[PDB]
Amino acid sequence: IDPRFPHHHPRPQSFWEARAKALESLLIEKGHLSSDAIERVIKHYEHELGPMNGAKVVAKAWTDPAFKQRLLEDSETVLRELGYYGLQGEHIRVVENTDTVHNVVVCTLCSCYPWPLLGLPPSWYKEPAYRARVVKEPRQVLKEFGLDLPDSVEIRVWDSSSEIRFMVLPQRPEGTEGMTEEELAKLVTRDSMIGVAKIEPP
């Protein structure tokens, strides 16, 4: 390491690991943290939360037209009544895909995503390629996910610059006649609720 060029040399990942362990250790010794407080958080985010909550809301909206309408009129109220509320999910809005409007969501500045409804963001959602590109060339970004929209569909990209969060309500596909609420919820993918994919007929 030449001391004119320290900015050329990143911390190895082993450094972040060690830092993490140092902070845990210091915090436990000083009584700021405990073993069970850390593990309660981890349990919440790795296992308690997931895209299955948004998937239930999507299938409800699809099978109950009165609820779909309540949801689009005042999603913060409705979602909170369902229990889908919490850290980074205090103000959740639902934006409806229609035949000529496709919504996609992003956090260009970091990784903001409604944990209480959708769980933890995709790996790619937090990375520069998607953050940088989707606001400038959403049609090219979507093609890489397999979604090639016509020139006549409008794309609205929703950048999460505040604590307001967005979830996309995808269209019910063709070929799902007579299936139940619970069955339809198993069709709902994590990606359709970020707007990077439509839902395939089953």
């Binding site: 990942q13 082993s14 260009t108």
Partner: protein, 227 residues
């Protein structure tokens, strides 16, 4: 601040690495799980950060090579360290020696402690959240439908005012209410809430591309001016 975190509009970052969601694992290392517990563990107790403004500025202040190489929860480890040291919950020296110890012996045993009352605290944060909505006495400066021009400003501290949306015409899509103001809250300067708006921008105004693309962005009142 105009840092590498503000990537909207940049070129060169390459293709998006699609993975099917059922293959897209959350954590591959125990320290990434640790990062999550440290952030919510501290925030739930007002340690280093009362909300996400202070958490976000620590990330933005990382060296650009660290930012693009740390991996994602490496950001989180960085900001935890930065904010805990900065408020004097932790000493800088003390933290570096302890880091050195786990670098040199990564097997060193972690001490264990059970505090069920703390668990309860932390759960309150996860379930109740930290809504930044506040009421203020002033009236909104803008209204739905109104054409505004975003300011040409370059705050050297934290903002939510992305470079790509600076100095652009747009139209108020919604008046949310007043929310804690990130540019001051991040630096511990008061909540000083301001009206927040959703603002619609056309691709032609943002980029010079005429095509049917739009970006919606939430912008605090002080980022914008009437025309």
């Amino acid at each position: 601040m105009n840092g590498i975190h503000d990537v909207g509009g940049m070129d060169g970052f390459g293709k998006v690495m699609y993975v099917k969601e059922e293959e897209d694992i959350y954590f591959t290392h125990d320290w990434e799980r640790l990062a999550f517990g440290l952030v919510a563990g501290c925030m739930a107790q007002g340690l280093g950060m009362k909300a996400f403004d202070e958490f976000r500025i620590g990330i933005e202040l990382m060296r650009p090579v660290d930012y693009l190489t740390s991996s994602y929860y490496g950001h989180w480890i960085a900001t935890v360290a930065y904010n805990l040291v900065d408020t004097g919950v932790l000493d800088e020296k003390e933290l570096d020696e302890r880091t050195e110890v786990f670098l040199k012996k990564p097997d060193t045993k972690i001490p264990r402690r059970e505090d069920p009352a703390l668990v309860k605290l932390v759960e309150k944060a996860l379930y109740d959240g930290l809504s930044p909505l506040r009421e203020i006495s002033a009236s909104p400066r803008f209204k739905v439908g109104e054409r505004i021009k975003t300011k040409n400003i370059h705050p050297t501290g934290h903002t939510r005012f992305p470079r790509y949306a600076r100095d652009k015409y747009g139209v108020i899509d919604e008046v949310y209410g007043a929310h804690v103001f990130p540019d001051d809250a991040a630096h511990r300067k008061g909540e000083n809430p301001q009206y927040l708006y959703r603002v619609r921008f056309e691709a032609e105004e943002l980029w010079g591309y005429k095509q049917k693309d739009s970006v919606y962005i939430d912008l605090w009142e002080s980022y914008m001016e009437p025309v």
